[model samples]
Target chain A: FNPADIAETLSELHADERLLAFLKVPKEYKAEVFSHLDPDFQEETIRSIGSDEVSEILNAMTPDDRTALFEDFPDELIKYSINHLNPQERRIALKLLGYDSDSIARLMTPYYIQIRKEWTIKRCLQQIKKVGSKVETMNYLYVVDERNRLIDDIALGSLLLAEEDTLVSEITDNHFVAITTTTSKEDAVQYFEKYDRAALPIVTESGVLVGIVTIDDILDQIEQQNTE
Target chain B: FNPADIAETLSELHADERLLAFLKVPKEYKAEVFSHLDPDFQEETIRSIGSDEVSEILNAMTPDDRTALFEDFPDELIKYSINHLNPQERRIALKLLGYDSDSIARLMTPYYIQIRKEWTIKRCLQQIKKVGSKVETMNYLYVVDERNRLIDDIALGSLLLAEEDTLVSEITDNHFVAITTTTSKEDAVQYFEKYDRAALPIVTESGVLVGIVTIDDILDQIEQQNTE
Candidate 1:
């Protein structure tokens, strides 16, 4: 069974048995199962579990999943969890929660590539290769100016079809839809529906690209709300 | 206002006035507006309109949208519309409606690129550029072998990040998710949600790649069901 199915089974168990049953799940599946658990169950699991166990699961989660878990958390539990996180994970968790609480920023991940407009596709590809595995998706590469302001978002296909020596600036149309940090989740959902984008760049009012929100994350949110 | 919004307004009009008002919409927006209209209104408008006007609107719609519209149509109307369609569109319409009525094949469009596995990325890209604009999306290129069996699906990003001389087979992982023509729409939706794919390859039982189903098409179906 998948992590979601396992999570579903776990959600049906009594509180005390649930914690013990969860510990028996394979280590790799534990965090994913926990990520898929009901918010109430997630809260119950973490609170009832050992400190080290909670810390490990929190750190193992992808930044987007971790942020989503944290969004529903009470201040006291969030503080406790944050303190247990590894420094790097702690920093990411803090930075993500720093944005507006009810905004789509809660769904954004800071794991996208932003390239300079002056760079050639060859150089850009080289840079992307170095960190692609750790990023959310490499389907789109964002172009930014010296001021770190967003200029355009290019699909990976466009770059592949272009000459190696072609500059990013030459290929960009400078037309891309963007949602600001404070944009509500409902409005952001509409943007994705309208644009039919797999992922959308999240920016600030000043047009500085900060993060990206993918369709799966939005779909998950929709599914959760519908289930509720 | 957008076609969807215009369609919404038209849907609220009296039946007698709706068709005439729909005709007032600009030619460029006519098909899109028709595509967005409520199924009842769409049927009403098409049935009330002249044969040439109906054919013009049907021909202007994307194949996937046109298929979806036809799926709701009665046999007599479908027959009438097919007779009015341009020969090319009539063939496409007949072919699409030939599949199992409730199958995801209804949502698939024969508008994706399939490249030979032995071809180099340079050659594959050259082929993509020649017909890119008319295709649904260029983000993913499917690889097929001598027998036209699907070998793999490669993201455009992987091709962009590889050496230009790399053979399509060399870059492909030879792992792709595919659904047969008989797969149900709900199952296909789950596959997309599970895999986080923007598009999925649709193949015959023997593995011949035939078409692709995109995320936006799925999203529109979901939205329509929810609104009802």
Candidate 2:
């Protein structure tokens, strides 16, 4: 079941039972399930378990999810809980919050699988295998030039079709789409829909690959704006 | 420029002149640009082109785009152009019409790339390379069991990051989300927004993979509803 689906079953339960149930849902699923709980239920779980598990939950979340939960939090709780996060996770929290609320920058994560056009197919796969799990999306990989300028994007299928010795540049159809850090949330939604991308590259004005904004995060941005 | 950006530039242009300028764009970009045009402009273009070219236009469009374009059209034009489509295309048109306008069935295209989980990664690449451009999204691929039920979906990246000899099932984490062909357009939007997927699988009550619904069509439906 979806975490959101699981969370709803606990919606009408009393606090103690809900906390017990939420805890029993396996460690891997806990943060996601708790993130989807009703805010009142969220508070109940937090109060029962206190800040230690709450800090873990916040840090365990994806950068986009963490920032969203932080978006609605009271300033004091935000300060206290974010302060408790590990240094690396806290840095991610601070960086996301640093952007203006409406900036797509706030919705982007500096995590994506990027490869250079000069690399061989063998090298590109090696790079992906090294850090693939850490990136926001592995469905569509971005290609860059030696200067690290965003170049093209390919579905993994394209790579699979090529020989190991093939240079990434030789195989690229040179198709790419991107948006900027300052793109308005509304415009980004239109762009994403029009382009039909799972995620879009975010480039600096001069075409440097700064980060990526995945579809899930963009949806979270819109959903947050509406519910707020 | 984004096609939407191009579409918006002419957003303010008046009929005959707008239609004149619209023709100057490259032929392949016409359908996309026309999809984003102001409805008044779209109506004017349809009238000027008459039903012959208009039937070609409708036939050129994707299933969702065609259905959406067909949704608004005056009864006379609808009857004429739909009748002109190739027998196969006309059947597709009528089947979409048979569904309630709000159902996701109206937004789904039977065109998609599918593979069996027990296939070699090399075989999967061969299949995608053969007809990838014809599908809505090539970045994400669906995996099915021997019984033709959707078992998983993998990013092209996962395949690229693995060896060609690897079985598709060996790499699959088996995660998938699907919607009923009967899902409401409004509820489909929320589910799309919540999940942030490029396309969603549309399944039968018994979990048969009937077709896929791409994101662009859903956005078209919402934008059409709002502007009206």
- Please report how far candidate 2 places residue A120 from its true position, in Å: 3.2
DockQ, prediction 1: 0.39
Report lDDT (CA) for all predictions.
Answer: 0.84, 0.76
Model 2: per-residue Cα lDDT over A8-91, one tens digit each: 787668876888888878778788787677676665555557667777776777777667667767787679768778998888
Best by TM-score: 2
Segments of candidate 2 deviating more than 4 angstroms: A39-55, A144-166, A170-178, A183-187, A203-208, A223-228, B10-12, B50-56, B144-155, B160-163, B169-175, B222-228
Chain A superposition TM-score per model: 0.85, 0.85
The candidate 1 chain B region of ten consecutive residues with least summed lDDT is B219-228
lDDT string, candidate 1, A1-228, tens digits: 657668778888987788889899999779988877778878877787788988889888888898888878899999998998999989988999998777899899888988888899888878788777678888888998998898999887677678889989899888788999989887788888866789999999999888899988887666666676
> What's the TM-score of each model vs. the native?
0.78, 0.84
Docking class of 1: acceptable
For candidate 2, the docking band is: acceptable
Cα RMSD (angstroms) for every candidate in the order listed: 4.8, 3.5
Chain B of candidate 1 achieves a TM-score of 0.85
Per-residue lDDT over B1-228 for candidate 1, one digit per residue giving the tens place of the 0 to 100 score = 656667879888997898889899999879978877777777887788888898889888878888888888898988887888898878877888899877999999888988888898889879888877667889889898889899898877677667779888787777788999979887788887766778999999999988899987887666755676
